[PDB]
Design a protein around this nucleic acid. Structure first.
Lengths: 293, 458, 295
RNA sequence: UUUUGACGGACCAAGUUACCCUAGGGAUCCUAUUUAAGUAUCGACAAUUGGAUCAGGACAUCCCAAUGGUGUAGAAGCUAUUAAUGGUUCGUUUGCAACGAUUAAAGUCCUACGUGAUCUG
RNA sequence: AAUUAUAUAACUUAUCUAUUUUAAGUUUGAAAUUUC
């Protein structure tokens, strides 16, 4: 049953609807999703979070009309609201509390982050090094979201931040900090703010990126700094060791060229490289304290 | 349209019902059939499709067994056959014609479809008739494993040793495998591996009494034509059955088995034996359409093929969710599409296998065994899997990329409707864009005329 | 029948034995776990971490003998070693494909648990309190987070996840056995569990706060000042309370902090997202003290 | 274009047309077979959106129940056989997971969402 | 739509003018080609 009320339109799922068929190609295929510039959202709260953040939505599929009325319909101008089968939603999602929402792939540089962290926002950049765990990436973004980092960088090979599972792990953290994906190491220096020192928390797999002939003479002798010392006198960039790769070679080389050090976190054994969420969390937070003080 | 008291089951069923053929209508060579694929040109008409429905629920091979003579009439071992292979209660048409002459030592050429009992057609006389005593040449390593496994199972009942040699394998490794295994009465080897052993003189065919060639058309490929010639010069061949039974001058009995035969094979056989000494047997269903097998044709663009494939996969998932369903076989023309498509499947969190010719030989062997073990019900494979692949439980064969030739389709088609098939097989083929419509037109035209497909002459 | 190979003794199990049936229900059905008070541990080196750390073994079942060699052979002498079919193991665990091995454990006693000295090198005078935790990955991640952070001791209040639930332990992947944990802490005894008057800081920006207007949060319960998380809060022995996943901190926690002289710590989040994942909620505050305490 | 160096493969890009053109097609729980327990007339079994309401069945046994053994004195337990007998709650789920509160136990599943037959155009 | 889009138009640089220390880029598109 399709209903129009007060200029607000929500449809019902139709038998053989090609809209659902086209969505399936878009959702799981990130290159096609990037080609279509879309993302998928899960949950009324997380759905409402994107609407509050000003992200442009695409389409909503829901088992009950109550969810649409429960959500702010004012922000649902651009979405074709479709009533769908509950079994279909769980089939569409690889994980859906009765509703799923398709959103335009946001550009975090273009996303609107309001004042509250901006008052607490730092000139601090978080860099994820070969972060291949979707759970950590979303779990990481809480720290960046709560910390107030000016920007977040993910190196090439890291998980797609806009993947809906990463959103679930971060529970909307993508709408709370700028994230840059698939950054090339050669272009990383351009991604650093002016006068920015790059700090690498060091815990090795990164030694496999070395030519065998030059393997042993290519190790940087970059200074080791205790993470408890002051490092935020100027804008700083933070590197996080990947779960499988740890801190990469290029991060160490870049830090020396940028005048930085190793803001070294003594890594407790049992975790070969401190959990990327754990490693990410510590580096940001007292930086707020250091510059606040 | 008026409702006739007795309609006819659709021989051709299409998304557009106007062109469906319900009843007894045969058009013939001169008449241009109004095929569903007749004008499949302008891709704007999305989702066009037609399917050929299954006509029989009982296996045609089991049908008419009463009209075929018993094994005793074939000169046949039966107790071992009953224990080893009880499933073959009565001989097939190919088996009945082929077995008797083979026991008499007459050279035999057999043209029959896959799954018609060709393997058993020569194996039974081979065992009764019997420095190896028998040689089996197979073009693909995949077939070698099945033939060796099938032969080993028969050998285990008879206490015989069978080994496999796959082509493309290193000389050092090939020698290592040979030395680590005991002497085998019958050897199954590929031209690449067999040629390497012959060059290194690890085996001699002067004492060979029986040579078996499986998939002669594929064995005759230029990739193996030179290797076969090198094998032939080392192999003495019997000229008449009398010499085969002569103890003073024993010679090797030649038997040929294939689904198609390239023109000129007679000249190759003529130089080895007289043309009149070759017994040629052709199956009644050779190059014939299978009515009991469902064939599905769908209009999908490259973007829509992924869309429909997901829908088809979901349909199979729903079928499994209600009642047990057979495995699904996905055929692709190129490895790159398999890898490109495979990543999409991985994004869908779907358990699936990827098989293509360029994968490591060791890696390919393990995956093939895993699929036989039932590790995963979804297998994406290239044309390397269109030969020597077990598909007794495969319910749906999906040709994601349209087969380039009808002969390849037949090998893919033979995967369904095999002896002992638990589930009714189905075939699905995709056409992307106006690239190719004649091939679909030819297949559809033959079905309406109930005639063999063009270009299939052996 | 026990098979001896390379000094390792293992029995060959037969499917359908009453022992197998009991394990299936415990792992699959959480209420049966509460009824029987039994737990499941998976993984040969994960089992090794548990037993070396004082976990109480009941029996170990493996698909292949190779796992036994990687198992804590020192702790297998008195534990029943039975080689079982992988299909039997699959029917048991919430995961279709376990790591070829699983072990039956009773509720370990924290008093007898032995934790590696590695956290102690980085351990802080900081104690953690968990409030109505409901997610297993978060708890396993929290303890893996603690195993990465170095929390001195952890207090679990009533209503939290069963720390020994099989999926909870899998996420910890040995972190459950690396940090001290106290279970079933009564809210009245929470201040006594901490050093008396230990400044307790409650993580507040929560799900309950989304449904409830921010203004109506200080009428009947003790009023806690809202402080920025980065402002030094570890000048005295500090305690941190973390709300449950997508639920939030409880009323009792807010009462606790004021009684001990603590205050609310504020996690500035971009408007447009009311809260975030609870697992790192401990981590974000736990590390903040870590550097402050180290300095 | 011949040579020297440490098995499987020949093409990509939307709408719209009543401004149109051509080709045409229309209108202007049954049903059909087969079987026949009970072939005048019939005829089972078969073969050819969330929910609510009520559950049925499988045993791969959770509780209940029948037993052997015991590192079982008794009673509790632990291990082992037999058994599907009836049962196996109500909710929260920031959505694949898990928690709360109870229960003798809140087994694991299957049964076209297991199963509801407005009114109008 | 995809793909280009030195019609033009703009800016940058030449250009042409002042002083004084159209072409080449890019962008729009007059359009072109292919498919729908």
């Amino acid at each position: 049953h399709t209903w129009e009320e007060a200029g607000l339109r929500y449809d019902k799922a139709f038998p053989g609807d090609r809209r659902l068929s086209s969505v399936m190609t878009i959702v799981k295929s990130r290159p096609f999703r990037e080609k279509q510039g879309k993302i998928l959202l899960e949950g009324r709260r997380l759905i409402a979070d994107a609407l509050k953040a000003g992200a442009v939505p695409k389409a909503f599929f829901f088992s009950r009309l109550e969810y649409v009325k429960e959500l702010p319909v004012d922000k649902l101008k651009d979405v074709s609201l479709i009533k769908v089968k509950f079994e279909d939603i769980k089939d569409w999602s690889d994980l859906p509390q009765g509703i799923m929402g398709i959103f335009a792939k946001p550009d975090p540089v273009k996303m609107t982050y309001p004042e509250t962290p901006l008052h607490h926002t730092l000139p601090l950049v978080l860099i994820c090094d070969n972060l291949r765990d979707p759970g950590n990436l979303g779990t990481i973004l809480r720290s960046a979201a709560g910390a107030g980092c000016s920007k977040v960088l993910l190196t090439k090979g890291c998980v797609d931040a806009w993947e809906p599972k990463v959103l679930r792990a971060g529970m909307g953290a993508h709408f709370q900090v700028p994230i840059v994906n698939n950054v090339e190491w050669e272009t990383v220096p351009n991604h650093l703010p002016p006068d920015t020192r790059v700090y690498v928390a060091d815990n090795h797999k990164y030694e496999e990126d070395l030519d065998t002939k030059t393997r042993k003479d290519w190790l940087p002798k970059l200074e080791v700094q205790s993470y408890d010392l002051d490092w935020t006198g100027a804008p700083a960039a933070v590197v996080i060791g990947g779960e499988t790769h740890g801190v990469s070679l290029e991060s160490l080389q870049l830090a020396e060229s940028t005048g930085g050090k190793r803001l070294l976190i003594p890594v407790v054994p049992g975790v070969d490289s401190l959990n990327s969420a754990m490693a990410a969390s510590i580096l940001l937070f007292e930086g707020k304290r250091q510059l606040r003080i | 349209r008026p409702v006739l008291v007795r309609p006819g089951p659709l021989l051709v069923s299409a998304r557009r019902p106007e062109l469906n053929q319900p009843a007894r209508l045969t058009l013939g060579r001169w008449e241009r059939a109004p095929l569903a694929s007749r004008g499949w040109k302008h891709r704007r008409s999305r989702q066009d499709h037609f399917s050929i429905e299954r006509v029989q629920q009982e296996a045609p091979a089991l049908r008419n067994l009463s009209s075929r003579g018993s094994f005793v009439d074939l000169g046949l071992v039966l107790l071992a056959l009953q224990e080893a292979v009880p499933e073959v209660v009565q001989p097939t048409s190919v088996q009945s014609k082929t077995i008797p002459p083979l026991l008499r030592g007459r050279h035999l050429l057999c043209a029959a479809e896959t799954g018609s009992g060709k393997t058993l057609s020569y194996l039974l006389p081979l065992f009764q008739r019997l420095a190896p005593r028998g040689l089996v040449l197979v073009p693909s390593r995949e077939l070698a494993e099945q033939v060796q496994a099938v032969a080993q199972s028969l050998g285990g009942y008879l206490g015989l040793q069978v080994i496999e040699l796959g082509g493309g394998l290193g000389m050092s490794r090939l020698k290592l495998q040979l030395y680590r295994r005991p002497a085998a009465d019958v050897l199954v080897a590929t031209p690449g591996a067999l040629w390497k052993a012959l060059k290194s003189q690890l085996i001699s065919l002067q004492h060979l009494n029986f040579i078996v060639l499986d998939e002669v058309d594929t064995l005759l490929d230029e990739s193996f034509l030179e290797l076969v010639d090198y094998i032939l010069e080392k192999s003495p061949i019997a000229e008449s059955p009398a010499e085969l039974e002569d103890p003073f001058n024993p010679k090797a009995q030649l038997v040929l088995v294939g689904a198609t035969f390239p023109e000129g094979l007679n000249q190759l056989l003529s130089k080895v034996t007289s043309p009149d000494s070759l017994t040629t047997i052709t199956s009644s269903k050779l190059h014939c359409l299978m009515p009991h097998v469902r064939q599905t044709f769908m209009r999908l663009k490259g973007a829509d093929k992924v869309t429909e494939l997901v829908q088809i996969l979901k349909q199979q998932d729903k079928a499994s969710k209600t009642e047990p369903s057979g495995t699904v076989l996905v055929f692709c023309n190129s490895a790159s599409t398999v890898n490109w498509l495979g990543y999409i499947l991985d994004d869908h969190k779907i358990q699936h296998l990827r098989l293509q010719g360029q994968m490591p030989a060791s890696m390919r062997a393990g995956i093939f065994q895993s699929f036989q073990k039932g590790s995963q019900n979804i297998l994406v494979c290239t044309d390397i899997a269109s030969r020597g692949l077990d598909s007794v439980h495969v319910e749906v064969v999906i040709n994601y990329d349209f087969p380039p030739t009808l002969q390849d389709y037949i090998h893919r088609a033979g995967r369904v409707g095999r002896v002992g098939s638990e589930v009714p097989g189905s075939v699905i083929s995709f056409v992307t864009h106006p690239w190719d419509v004649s091939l679909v037109q030819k297949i559809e035209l033959a079905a309406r005329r109930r005639r063999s497909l063009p270009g299939l002459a052996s």
